[PDB]
Each structure stands twice: as C-alpha cells, then as structure tokens.
Design a protein around this ligand. Structure first.
Ligand code: HEM
Ligand code: HEM
Ligand code: BY7
Ligand code: BY7
Ligand code: H4B
Ligand code: H4B
Ligand code: ZN
Lengths: 413, 409
C-alpha cells in the first residue's frame, strides 16, 4: 500500500494526509474489484495466534505512555509471554484495560461521537461470576452514566472469553429498550425491532405489560450458564416525554424515549483478548431517535400520523410532506431533551465536532478511520460538513466488533 | 463468489453474479475502503483485447455469439487496429455502447431509463462550428418544450491525444460566477474559474446572478471558440413557492436541462473525450446542492430569515426547515411550468425497482450508495436501507482532467 493517502474536503478544499491506515489489522471486506462500503456486516485464539496479537498491543500501550523499549516494557512483554505459554491466555493490567477500551472507541469508524473518546469511565467487572453480579454492575453503570440527566460516557467490562463455553453475554442489544409485541392480526405493538428478543423474554418467564413503551428486562448470562432475567429498577431509567415547542397537539401522540443509549451486544477485542460482554453508553444524537427510531417504516413509523396532524397534503410525494413532518419530529425530540436537561446533541453540532476531531487526529495520530455511510446523518446530509468530507475506512485494534446473537449459539443446560 | 445484498427495511435479499464480469479497479483494498473518495487513485496491443471484449458482449447481447457476423466483426476490427492504430464502431455498436455506459454508471440514480437514450452520432464533426451545430440540435431535441428527453451527442474519438475534441464547459447550460472587489461571489461560485476563461477569451459578461455562460468548444485539438446558445433554446424556470408568496421575490431561477459535458465515454478501448449527455433533474440537485451548499448559491440564511425562523441555535433545525421549503418550491415550480423533474422519493423508489430488474435479468447492478442516497431525508427513502455493491463495468463514463490544465495554445 502507498504510504501517504490524501483525503479532501470538497467544501473547504482542505486536504489531509493519512499514514495511520498502514497500521490496519483486520479486513474491510472490499477488494480491488468490488467495494462493500454500504454492506452492514461484511473455538478461541491458540497460543501461537495470541503471542503476536498481545505483543502488538503491549508495544502500542507502552508507546503511548512514552516508555517504549523501557525495562517495564520488556518486563511486561516477558510476563505476558510466560502467561500465554503456561495458561494459553493472559490478563490485562487495569491501566491496559482502560487504554484498550478508550482506543476501541477512538478506533470505531462508525461512531460520530469520538471527540469524547478519552473521557470514558471504565468499570472493571472482571471479578464478576454470576448473573446477579452482572446485574449489580449494570445497575451501577446505568446510575453513573445517567447522572440525573447529565449523561457521562461509560463502559463496564465483564470477564474475557476463555474456552468459548463460559462466555459472559448481555442478551439485550441495548441495556434500555422498548418491547415489541406481534399481534394475531399481524400488527405490532411497541417497537418492531425488538419482537424477537421480547418473545425470548416472555418464554424465559417475563410477564409483559403489553404497552407501547415497556422497558425490557435484562437477560444476563454469566460463565456460559443459562441466562437469567432481571428488572431494571424503574427509578434508574430516565425517560423523556416528547413535546413540540409550537405544536401543542404533539404531546397527545403520547411519545417518549429513554435518555441512555447503551449498546450491550458488541465484542471488545484487546490484544487478542475477547470481552464478549462490555456494555457501553454515551448520549444520543437527536436523529437516532427522531429519524430512525420514530420514522423508519420498520420501527415506530409515525410520519403519517404526524403529517395528518400537520394538515399536510399527503397525496403527492412531491409535496415533500414526509420531509416536512420529519423535521418537526426532530425539532420536538431536541426540544424535549433540552427542556428536561437530559444531554443530547443535534446532528449539526455533532458533525461539526466530528470534523474538528478528525482534523486533530490527522494531526496528532496520522489519520482517523471513518465510515462515511454511517457518519453522515440520516436527514439533511449535505448541509452537515461530513457529507463533503472524504473519509478512509479501515479497522484498527483494539476494536468493538459484532458477534452472533447469543440465542443462536447458546448450549442450553 | 456469489454476493448477497440485503434491504434492511424489506428484508429482500438479492444475489450478485455480475460483479464477476468486472476487470477495472475500484481503489479499495482488503484493508482500506475508499468508498467516499470522489476520484480514487492506448496502443494496438492494449486495444484489441478491449475491442474483443466489447464486440463479444455486443454479440452476446443480440444472441448471435459465435455467429458469422460476430466472427467477421472480430476479424474486421483486428485488421483495422493493425493497419490504422485504432478502429471505428458501427452505428449499432455506438448506440449499444452509450446506453450501456449509462446502465453501468454506479453513481446514477436515474438508470431505470437507461435504454431510452437518444444517441446522436457526431463522429463526422471537424470544427468548433460543427460542434456548436450538433450541440444546439441536442439541446433543442432534449428540451422538447419542457417534456425532457434523454440524449447524448458523441464527437470523434481520441486519436493521438493532441487532437482531442472537448467541450470546455462542465455542463452545456450553467450560470456564470463572478469574484467581487469585496471578496464575495456573484452568481455561481462553482463556475468562477470557467467564467474568467470566457471573459479572457472575449465574452462580455452581463454580471448578473444567472447569466447563461457561452459554450467554449475545442475541435480536433485546436484553441477553443466561444458561442452563445440561442436563448429560445434555453428553458428556465422561475422558482416560486406554493404558499410563501414572498418566495418569488428572492429572484431565483434555474435551467430545465441538466447536461453533463465534461466526461469521457469509453467503449471498447476507444475514448470519446466529448460526449455531452442530458436527462432531467432530480429536485434535490437544484434545491439542496446548487442552492444550499456553502460553496454554491448558499441561500439558506436568506430563506430562513423570510420564514422568521429562530437562527441563534443550530438545535432549532432552522437550516433543515428552510431546506425542505426550498425543495418544495423547486418541485412546484418545474411542475407548474410543465418541465420534467422527479422528486427524490419517486426517483429512489424507481431505483430500487430498477435494481430488482437488473438482478433478475443481468445478475447484478453496480451502485454507489454514497452517490445514490439523496443529500436530504436520506433514511426516509428506500435506497438508504438498500445494501449496494459498487464495481466498475465497461463501457463507462469516466472523469478526465479539465482541458485548461492540459491545453497548449
Ligand atoms: C458520547 C456520545 C456518543 C455519541 C453522540 C455517539 C454517536 C453515535 C452514533 C450516532 C452512532 C451511529 C448509531 C446508529 O445509527 O446505529 C454511533 C455508533 C457507534 N458508537 Fe458512538 N456515540 C457516543 C458514544 C459512544 C461510546 C461511549 C462508545 C464506546 C465506548 C461508542 C462506540 C460506538 C460504536 C462501536 C458504534 C457503531 C455501532 C454499530 O456498528 O452498531 N459510541 N455512535
Ligand atoms: C434521465 C434522468 C436522469 C436522472 C433523474 C439522473 C439523476 C442523477 C443524479 C441525481 C446524479 C448524481 C448527480 C450529482 O450529485 O452530481 C447522477 C449522476 C450521473 N448520471 Fe444520471 N440522471 C439522469 C440521466 C442520465 C443520463 C442520460 C446519463 C448518461 C447517458 C447519466 C449518467 C450519469 C453519470 C455518468 C453520473 C455520475 C456523474 C459523476 O460521477 O460526476 N444520467 N444522475
Ligand atoms: C453509545 C452510543 C451512543 C449513541 N448516541 N448511539 C449509539 C448507537 C445505539 C443504537 C443502536 C441501534 C440498534 C437497534 C436496532 N437493532 C437491534 C435492530 C439503533 C440506533 C438508532 F436506531 F440509530 F437510533 C442506535 C451508541
Ligand atoms: C444527465 C444528468 C441528469 C441529472 N439529473 N443530473 C446530472 C448531474 C448534474 C450535476 C452536476 C454537478 C457538477 C457541478 C458542481 N461542480 C462543478 C462543483 C452537480 C450536481 C449537483 F447538483 F450537485 F447534484 C448535478 C446529470
Ligand atoms: C444499507 C446501509 O448500509 C444501511 O442502511 C446503513 C446506512 N447508514 C447507516 N448509518 C447509521 N448511522 N446507522 C445505520 O443503521 C445505517 N444503516
Ligand atoms: C466526500 C463525498 O464522497 C462527496 O461529498 C460526495 C458525497 N455524496 C455525493 N452524492 C452525490 N449524488 N453527489 C455528490 O457530489 C456527492 N458528493
Ligand atoms: Zn470499499
């Protein structure tokens, strides 16, 4: 590969030079003949697979603290090598775990919020042994991150994978989500995205309220055991009722959403170690709720109901009634969160901050992998600065990865 | 391998076999994706295999592969490359090649129309006056009093690279842009440079906001020449809004005919450095990009003011509001004037339908998600949720350098 790749911003003419791509470790899925950039998704490490992965990471950590080649560096390398040799794995030091998590975020090409990457509270839950313990750790995480509406980004890291039959998993895809219920008539109550998981919960013993916004229980797997159900204490779940600054009828739609976005189904990979349970949370960009959660056809799908209330002509698509309603919905979301003092960021501010971040990273780090398809917001793309920004996408490690859904793999005891 | 693309809204899965037919590179590697880079990255010996490949797929498409006509054509092209260092396409081949360049254009959301393309053969042209005549005929045919019709005019192919035909304008119809003493820009900033070249070559600029530029036409490698397109051929739409009666007072207009004139058509090794082609607008091209890009007409503030919007915080989404109203005005104006235009909802729906057709009858459809998804309201259009595979098939339209960075006078 060429040593220097250039990216241009077509609005500012600013040109940046990427050297960081040379540290790329995993594959994108693209080839020289085909690009898979819009594709959503394109038994453990053996001793020999693990050695060079650990060393690569340890080298990187010690390079970051400006102690590369030091005695402490050679010693740590030696101790890790010993541990892999005699146990087929190793344990990260707390300092290394913290560095790794922060860098997994820093390296997450799909995330527009990375300007905040170095402010991440890391909760070390590697001593956890049971589902009840996992629940305690998750409650503490939710309460800390929620902070009464002044959200703080955080991750909780449960024990790494060993042989693959003792995995810790949060079965939920997010810590906080609403239930979806398929009706006999084929309609759906609640959030259609969560129907499958909701059914699993009901089968596991959950008694569902069968409402539009029922917070799902946590379904927690510790040490490869069958997963267990827990109800998040409702006082720990911050929610925001959605109203509009101009339209007084908006609150009559009875919408609300939860304050804390917390992904709980990804795998954190550090130095060849695999943490299959690492729920992390930040705060929302408005469009995630206002465009995707509310206006996607396969989600709450409210555009029509809002358009009717707006008295829009909905006979021709060229009236742009969908676009008009979409903006008002997103206005309402931003206004409801700001009024209730729950942290949220609009897509203009988030994308402008991301460009600033990206430029700093090109300066200090030699690049910043970014997935344009994901970085550009789902509405009003070209009036945000990221639309005009060329981006190089590549996979650095440590990283957050996708993993199969646990019910597809779990060996029921 | 066979590749699957999923639509995450409909759960429809399609299988791509067509990508196996490509030979040209995308720029990505196994480790770096360049999907959002705008521009990533003959001889007798290079020429014949490219000719062969092209002749072969032409004859495979009329179901006469390995026929006498096919055999003779391969022989005929062989002889001609050997004797003359190039070859000439039959008319049937020229038409097939141009339609297929469009069909293969991964960045075009308009391809459901690909096989309805009026092809004008201008390969007998020798002078800039000849070019002007061909271009005027194109513009008149394609404009059709508002009932727009897709067309392409093809001028002589490249020979030695010293005798190129080029249309210097980036589009056939575009508005001039002027640098002001006060540092700002009058008209369209995208064309400031081109405008200065016209002025420097003798164009007398009216210095308005929407002055149609002259054509600058280069024939057979010679210095380009200026021509004014007869005004009765230039269809324009005054932009007004269906509810905001103050909108027409913004003095906005645009032309009806989008006609890209700066691209290179490649067919079977032959390069056509002048092939202006035209269709009709998708509304967002004008209403979002031309009017609202910071580096273009940049009218959001002005509109937002007239709507009395709170402009202090970005979180009031005042920009988004102004953007939607502008695009409503553009659609309404073109529709009221009976000038062909498509909204991004209709155009993207048609593209999904087109993708389904292509997968069925052709085994795939190369598409660039970065370009196909509209510059506003992305995820409320079906293409946002549509996985797409991007790859390069030939014949194709390609970028080429601006003529003024290469031309010696
Ligand atoms: C602090 C405020 C944050 C904001 C505003 C933010 C914003 C976003 C947005 C808008 C997306 C795309 C979401 C989607 O459309 O599904 C995203 C994705 C992502 N974020 Fe961030 N994020 C934040 C915090 C975090 C944190 C704390 C982490 C990890 C420590 C993180 C890691 C990721 C990852 C891995 C993705 C890709 C998710 C996927 O592929 O499904 N983000 N972020
Ligand atoms: C007939 C109706 C048509 C519609 C609605 C349409 C729509 C579009 C749009 C929206 C784009 C993206 C434009 C941009 O963002 O700059 C585009 C690009 C493109 N179109 Fe189409 N188009 C049409 C006709 C045609 C025709 C007739 C041809 C050629 C024969 C063509 C070939 C191309 C090519 C090569 C591009 C890529 C331009 C570039 O890479 O800069 N299109 N089209
Ligand atoms: C930490 C964090 C902060 C932030 N602002 N956003 C995120 C992304 C979370 C997210 C997940 C998901 C996945 C849910 C649906 N599948 C399970 C089917 C969706 C969204 C959404 F829809 F974009 F808002 C957002 C994560
Ligand atoms: C044939 C055709 C039909 C159609 N509807 N659209 C096109 C693309 C035309 C087009 C060109 C260009 C290039 C001019 C700007 N640069 C010089 C900075 C831009 C756009 C737009 F508006 F940005 F989408 C659209 C071509
Ligand atoms: C098909 C396409 O890749 C898919 O719909 C992507 C597009 N861009 C996205 N961008 C974000 N932020 N989130 C998403 O879920 C998606 N979905
Ligand atoms: C950097 C990025 O590739 C560039 O801004 C692209 C994004 N998508 C686009 N999409 C279309 N249709 N037209 C464009 O000019 C662009 N510009
Ligand atoms: Zn790629």
């Amino acid at each position: 590969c060429p040593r220097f790749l250039k990216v241009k911003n077509w609005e500012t003419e600013v040109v940046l030079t990427d050297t960081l791509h040379l540290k790329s470790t995993l594959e994108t899925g693209c080839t020289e003949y085909i690009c898979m950039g819009s594709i959503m998704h394109p038994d453990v490490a053996t001793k020999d697979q693990l050695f060079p992965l650990a060393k690569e990471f340890i080298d990187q950590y010690y390079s970051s603290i400006k102690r590369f080649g030091s005695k402490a560096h050679m010693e740590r390398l030696e101790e890790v090598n010993k541990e892999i040799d005699t146990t087929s794995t190793y344990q990260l030091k707390d300092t290394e775990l913290i560095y790794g998590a922060k860098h997994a975020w820093r390296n997450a090409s799909r995330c527009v919020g990375r300007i905040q990457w170095s402010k991440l509270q890391v909760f070390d839950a590697r001593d956890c042994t049971t589902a009840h313990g996992m629940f305690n750790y998750i409650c503490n995480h939710v309460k800390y991150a929620t902070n009464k509406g002044n959200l703080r980004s955080a991750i909780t890291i449960f024990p790494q994978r060993t042989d693959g039959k003792h995995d810790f998993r949060v079965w939920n895809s997010q810590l906080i989500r609403y239930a979806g219920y398929k009706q006999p008539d084929g309609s759906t109550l609640g959030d259609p995205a969560n129907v499958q998981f909701t059914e699993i919960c009901i089968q596991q013993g959950w008694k569902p309220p069968r409402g539009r916004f029922d917070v799902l229980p946590l379904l927690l797997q510790a040490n490869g055991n069958d997963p267990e159900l827990f109800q998040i204490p409702p006082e720990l779940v911050l929610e925001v009722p959605i109203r509009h600054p101009k339209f007084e009828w908006f609150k009559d739609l009875g919408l609300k959403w939860y304050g804390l976005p917390a992904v709980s189904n990804m795998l954190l990979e550090i130095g060849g170690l695999e943490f299959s349970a690492c729920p992390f949370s930040g705060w929302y960009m408005g469009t995630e709720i206002g465009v995707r959660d509310y206006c996607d056809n396969s989600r709450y799908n409210i555009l029509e109901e809002v358009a009717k209330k707006m008295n829009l002509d909905m006979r021709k698509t060229s009236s742009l009634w969908k676009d008009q309603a979409l903006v008002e919905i997103n206005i309402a979301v931003l206004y409801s969160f700001q009024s209730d003092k729950v942290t949220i960021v609009d897509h203009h501010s988030a994308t402008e901050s991301f460009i600033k971040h990206m430029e700093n990273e090109y300066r200090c780090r030699g690049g910043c992998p970014a997935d344009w398809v994901w970085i550009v917001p789902p509405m009003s793309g070209s009036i945000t600065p990221v639309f005009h920004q060329e981006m190089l996408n590549y996979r650095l490690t440590p990283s957050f990865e996708y993993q199969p859904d646990p019910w597809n793999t779990h060996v029921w005891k």
